[PDB]
Tab-separated table of all heavy atoms in Angstrom:
chain	number	residue	atom	x	y	z
A	1	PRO	N	8.960	11.419	3.572
A	1	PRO	CA	8.533	10.602	4.702
A	1	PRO	C	7.077	10.258	4.758
A	1	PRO	O	6.146	11.125	4.894
A	1	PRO	CB	8.924	11.495	6.011
A	1	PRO	CG	8.770	12.827	5.470
A	1	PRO	CD	9.242	12.756	4.030
A	2	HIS	N	6.837	8.954	4.671
A	2	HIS	CA	5.454	8.445	4.668
A	2	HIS	C	5.173	7.554	5.886
A	2	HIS	O	6.036	7.095	6.536
A	2	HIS	CB	5.144	7.558	3.440
A	2	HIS	CG	5.764	8.241	2.203
A	2	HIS	ND1	6.535	7.475	1.333
A	2	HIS	CD2	5.552	9.427	1.670
A	2	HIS	CE1	6.934	8.237	0.334
A	2	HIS	NE2	6.307	9.463	0.458
A	3	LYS	N	3.855	7.365	6.274
A	3	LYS	CA	3.443	6.444	7.380
A	3	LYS	C	2.827	5.270	6.892
A	3	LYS	O	1.767	5.279	6.426
A	3	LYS	CB	2.527	7.409	8.359
A	3	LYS	CG	2.571	7.058	9.760
A	3	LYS	CD	1.475	7.552	10.461
A	3	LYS	CE	1.694	9.020	10.918
A	3	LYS	NZ	0.557	9.795	11.394
A	4	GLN	N	3.615	4.121	7.193
A	4	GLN	CA	3.011	2.839	6.899
A	4	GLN	C	1.861	2.518	7.787
A	4	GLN	O	1.703	2.764	8.852
A	4	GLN	CB	4.125	1.792	7.016
A	4	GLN	CG	3.814	0.527	6.259
A	4	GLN	CD	5.117	-0.368	6.086
A	4	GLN	OE1	6.180	0.050	6.343
A	4	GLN	NE2	4.865	-1.601	5.697
A	5	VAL	N	0.837	1.724	7.156
A	5	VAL	CA	-0.302	1.350	7.838
A	5	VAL	C	-0.837	0.121	7.300
A	5	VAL	O	-0.639	-0.188	6.102
A	5	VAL	CB	-1.422	2.433	7.813
A	5	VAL	CG1	-1.142	3.600	8.701
A	5	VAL	CG2	-1.570	2.862	6.410
A	6	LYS	N	-1.655	-0.671	7.982
A	6	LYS	CA	-2.309	-1.927	7.636
A	6	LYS	C	-3.576	-1.638	6.807
A	6	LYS	O	-4.368	-0.878	7.370
A	6	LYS	CB	-2.638	-2.823	8.799
A	6	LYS	CG	-1.226	-3.074	9.624
A	6	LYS	CD	-1.570	-3.849	10.934
A	6	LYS	CE	-1.973	-5.202	10.737
A	6	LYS	NZ	-2.562	-5.814	12.035
A	7	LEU	N	-3.808	-2.347	5.723
A	7	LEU	CA	-4.997	-2.203	5.033
A	7	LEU	C	-6.176	-3.256	5.344
A	7	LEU	O	-5.706	-4.248	6.059
A	7	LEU	CB	-4.683	-2.250	3.500
A	7	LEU	CG	-3.959	-1.139	2.847
A	7	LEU	CD1	-2.950	-1.680	1.789
A	7	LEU	CD2	-4.964	-0.134	2.249
A	8	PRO	N	-7.389	-2.910	5.198
A	8	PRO	CA	-8.427	-3.768	5.532
A	8	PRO	C	-8.556	-4.931	4.624
A	8	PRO	O	-9.235	-5.986	4.916
A	8	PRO	CB	-9.732	-2.948	5.196
A	8	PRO	CG	-9.270	-1.942	4.144
A	8	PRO	CD	-7.778	-1.678	4.472
A	9	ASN	N	-7.703	-5.025	3.602
A	9	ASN	CA	-7.712	-6.182	2.714
A	9	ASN	C	-6.828	-7.339	3.232
A	9	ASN	O	-6.933	-8.387	2.835
A	9	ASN	CB	-6.996	-5.757	1.308
A	9	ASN	CG	-8.026	-4.840	0.552
A	9	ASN	OD1	-8.923	-5.320	-0.051
A	9	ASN	ND2	-7.799	-3.516	0.668
A	10	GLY	N	-5.921	-6.912	4.289
A	10	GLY	CA	-5.061	-7.890	4.882
A	10	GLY	C	-3.577	-7.695	4.502
A	10	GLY	O	-2.717	-8.112	5.297
A	11	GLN	N	-3.335	-7.080	3.356
A	11	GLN	CA	-1.964	-6.724	2.865
A	11	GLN	C	-1.521	-5.378	3.351
A	11	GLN	O	-2.334	-4.504	3.749
A	11	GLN	CB	-1.874	-6.993	1.454
A	11	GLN	CG	-2.422	-8.283	0.856
A	11	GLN	CD	-1.466	-9.474	1.280
A	11	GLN	OE1	-0.309	-9.269	1.573
A	11	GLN	NE2	-2.035	-10.554	1.176
A	12	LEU	N	-0.233	-5.129	3.346
A	12	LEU	CA	0.292	-3.843	3.612
A	12	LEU	C	0.333	-2.974	2.406
A	12	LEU	O	0.342	-3.342	1.238
A	12	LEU	CB	1.765	-3.915	4.136
A	12	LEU	CG	1.736	-4.653	5.553
A	12	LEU	CD1	3.216	-4.729	6.088
A	12	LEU	CD2	0.934	-3.777	6.568
A	13	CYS	N	0.383	-1.624	2.558
A	13	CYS	CA	0.479	-0.643	1.636
A	13	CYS	C	1.578	-0.956	0.675
A	13	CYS	O	2.568	-1.740	0.886
A	13	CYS	CB	0.622	0.777	2.159
A	13	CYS	SG	-0.472	1.304	3.343
A	14	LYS	N	1.610	-0.435	-0.521
A	14	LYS	CA	2.506	-0.510	-1.688
A	14	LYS	C	3.570	0.454	-1.503
A	14	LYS	O	3.404	1.667	-1.261
A	14	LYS	CB	1.913	-0.659	-3.027
A	14	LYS	CG	1.383	-1.939	-3.440
A	14	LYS	CD	2.518	-2.885	-3.635
A	14	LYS	CE	2.195	-4.358	-3.193
A	14	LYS	NZ	2.836	-5.394	-4.113
A	15	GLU	N	4.899	0.102	-1.940
A	15	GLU	CA	5.950	1.054	-1.970
A	15	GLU	C	6.070	1.850	-3.308
A	15	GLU	O	5.658	1.282	-4.339
A	15	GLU	CB	7.320	0.234	-1.702
A	15	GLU	CG	7.180	-0.716	-0.471
A	15	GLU	CD	8.327	-0.524	0.481
A	15	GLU	OE1	9.356	-0.213	0.192
A	15	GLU	OE2	8.051	-0.705	1.744
A	16	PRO	N	6.579	3.024	-3.309
A	16	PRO	CA	6.873	3.796	-4.515
A	16	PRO	C	7.942	3.269	-5.520
A	16	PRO	O	9.047	3.148	-5.090
A	16	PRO	CB	7.333	5.114	-3.922
A	16	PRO	CG	8.001	4.798	-2.542
A	16	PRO	CD	7.146	3.580	-2.089
A	17	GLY	N	7.461	2.951	-6.595
A	17	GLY	CA	8.365	2.295	-7.595
A	17	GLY	C	7.995	0.917	-7.876
A	17	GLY	O	8.324	0.380	-8.946
A	18	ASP	N	7.601	0.152	-6.805
A	18	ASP	CA	7.412	-1.216	-6.987
A	18	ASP	C	5.961	-1.589	-7.534
A	18	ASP	O	5.020	-0.663	-7.346
A	18	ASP	CB	7.399	-1.861	-5.570
A	18	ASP	CG	8.842	-2.320	-5.290
A	18	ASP	OD1	9.574	-2.908	-6.121
A	18	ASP	OD2	9.286	-2.062	-4.150
A	19	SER	N	5.812	-2.551	-8.325
A	19	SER	CA	4.559	-2.970	-8.963
A	19	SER	C	3.500	-3.111	-7.968
A	19	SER	O	3.658	-3.573	-6.757
A	19	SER	CB	4.655	-4.192	-9.852
A	19	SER	OG	4.680	-5.326	-9.006
A	20	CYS	N	2.187	-2.844	-8.270
A	20	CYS	CA	1.080	-2.890	-7.327
A	20	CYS	C	0.039	-3.902	-8.005
A	20	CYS	O	0.091	-4.225	-9.155
A	20	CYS	CB	0.518	-1.637	-6.965
A	20	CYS	SG	1.794	-0.228	-6.784
A	21	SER	N	-1.101	-4.123	-7.241
A	21	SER	CA	-2.159	-4.889	-7.769
A	21	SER	C	-3.347	-4.024	-8.074
A	21	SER	O	-4.158	-4.425	-8.943
A	21	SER	CB	-2.502	-5.935	-6.664
A	21	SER	OG	-2.499	-7.230	-7.202
A	22	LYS	N	-3.572	-2.982	-7.360
A	22	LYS	CA	-4.720	-2.001	-7.547
A	22	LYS	C	-4.381	-0.598	-7.021
A	22	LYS	O	-3.579	-0.418	-6.015
A	22	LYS	CB	-5.799	-2.634	-6.842
A	22	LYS	CG	-6.672	-3.632	-7.730
A	22	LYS	CD	-8.022	-3.986	-7.036
A	22	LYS	CE	-8.615	-5.187	-7.725
A	22	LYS	NZ	-8.672	-5.039	-9.267
A	23	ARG	N	-4.945	0.372	-7.610
A	23	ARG	CA	-4.836	1.703	-7.186
A	23	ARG	C	-5.106	1.929	-5.731
A	23	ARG	O	-4.234	2.691	-4.999
A	23	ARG	CB	-5.558	2.648	-7.966
A	23	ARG	CG	-5.282	4.215	-7.803
A	23	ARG	CD	-5.870	4.974	-9.005
A	23	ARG	NE	-6.214	6.347	-8.541
A	23	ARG	CZ	-7.330	6.583	-7.934
A	23	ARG	NH1	-8.085	5.562	-7.540
A	23	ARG	NH2	-7.509	7.823	-7.437
A	24	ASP	N	-6.058	1.100	-5.156
A	24	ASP	CA	-6.367	1.251	-3.753
A	24	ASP	C	-5.190	0.681	-2.925
A	24	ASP	O	-5.158	1.093	-1.802
A	24	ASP	CB	-7.502	0.337	-3.493
A	24	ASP	CG	-8.496	0.855	-2.354
A	24	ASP	OD1	-7.891	1.139	-1.284
A	24	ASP	OD2	-9.727	0.847	-2.530
A	25	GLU	N	-4.338	-0.088	-3.447
A	25	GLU	CA	-3.185	-0.628	-2.778
A	25	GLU	C	-2.270	0.495	-2.437
A	25	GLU	O	-1.567	0.441	-1.329
A	25	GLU	CB	-2.513	-1.624	-3.482
A	25	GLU	CG	-3.362	-2.855	-3.905
A	25	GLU	CD	-2.558	-4.138	-3.991
A	25	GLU	OE1	-1.402	-4.109	-4.448
A	25	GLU	OE2	-3.038	-5.214	-3.866
A	26	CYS	N	-2.133	1.571	-3.213
A	26	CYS	CA	-1.298	2.668	-2.987
A	26	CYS	C	-1.758	3.471	-1.853
A	26	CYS	O	-2.992	3.928	-1.888
A	26	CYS	CB	-1.135	3.514	-4.194
A	26	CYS	SG	0.439	4.273	-4.583
A	27	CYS	N	-0.898	3.689	-0.754
A	27	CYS	CA	-1.245	4.452	0.382
A	27	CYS	C	-0.965	5.989	0.071
A	27	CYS	O	-0.670	6.470	-1.010
A	27	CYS	CB	-0.380	4.071	1.596
A	27	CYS	SG	-1.334	2.899	2.731
């Protein structure tokens, strides 16, 4: 169980298994 949150970049955290843009994207 994880807690979703909004990032300062404007986008939402990344999901486990799905491709990401940057390590920072991973919550």
Side-chain angles (χ1 to χ4, degrees):
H2 318 128
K3 207 189 282 170
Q4 198 163 348
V5 288
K6 303 166 71 184
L7 288 147
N9 291 281
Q11 306 288 343
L12 288 181
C13 305
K14 272 293 143 143
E15 316 232 322
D18 275 314
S19 79
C20 323
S21 237
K22 280 192 190 302
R23 193 161 146 282
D24 209 315
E25 301 210 329
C26 217
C27 259

